[PDB]
Amino acid sequence: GVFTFEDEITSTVPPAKLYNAMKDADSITPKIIDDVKSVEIVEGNGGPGTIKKLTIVEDGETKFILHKVESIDEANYAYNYSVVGGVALPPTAEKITFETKLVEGPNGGSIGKLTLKYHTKGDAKPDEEELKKGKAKGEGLFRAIEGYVLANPTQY
Numbered sequence: 001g002v003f004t005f006e007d008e009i010t011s012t013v014p015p016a017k018l019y020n021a022m023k024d025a026d027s028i029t030p031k032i033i034d035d036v037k038s039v040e041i042v043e044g045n046g047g048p049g050t051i052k053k054l055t056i057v058e059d060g061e062t063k064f065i066l067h068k069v070e071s072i073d074e075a076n077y078a079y080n081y082s083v084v085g086g087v088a089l090p091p092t093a094e095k096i097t098f099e100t101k102l103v104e105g106p107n108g109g110s111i112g113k114l115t116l117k118y119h120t121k122g123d124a125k126p127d128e129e130e131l132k133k134g135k136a137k138g139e140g141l142f143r144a145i146e147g148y149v150l151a152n153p154t155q156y
């Protein structure tokens, strides 16, 4: 089954600037997010199909997460990626897709439109705990990118 959820988050940063920084999330997030230690490309060049290995630290234990780049839509400020393996993927789940799209905020800032698609195996339903962790991670990244941009204004 596929379970779909929608959410919104705002930023002072304008969408073109925030999107360009999002494209560099692999190099940004290990720096700003304490739990994230590294992001390595295992397959592809960074485009759709590209597989990344994230090394994370949680409760003093090292764990890995696998992401697949689903789509990149520069024209629409859209970045889509799925969790396809590791600790962030419950056994019931086939995969979890995170869709981000930026649109202009009323005051020159940004609205981040988040879509979460949780793909279950069979008639399994999503784990709520895993879900809370996801949606959080949906923000915690957005904030990382935004904080980086605000802290390094020349960069973008």
Ligand SMILES: Oc1cc(O)c2c(c1)O[C@H](c1ccc(O)c(O)c1)[C@H](O)C2
Residues within 6 Å of the ligand: 025, 026, 029, 033, 035, 036, 039, 054, 056, 081, 136, 137, 140, 141
């Ligand atoms: O607050 C967090 C905590 C995390 O463990 C993670 C967060 C944010 O975002 C990371 C992240 C998310 C998306 C990326 O494209 C990426 O390179 C890194 C990852 O989901 C792991």
Ligand SMILES: Oc1cc(O)c2c(c1)O[C@H](c1ccc(O)c(O)c1)[C@H](O)C2
Residues within 6 Å of the ligand: 042, 043, 051, 066, 068, 084, 085
């Ligand atoms: O398109 C996919 C879908 C998956 O479920 C996976 C994909 C790619 O690749 C992962 C993967 C994991 C480690 C690798 O070195 C590698 O090249 C690919 C894993 O097999 C799980």
Ligand code: NA
Residues within 6 Å of the ligand: 029, 030, 031, 032, 033, 034, 035, 036, 037
């Ligand atoms: Na870190």
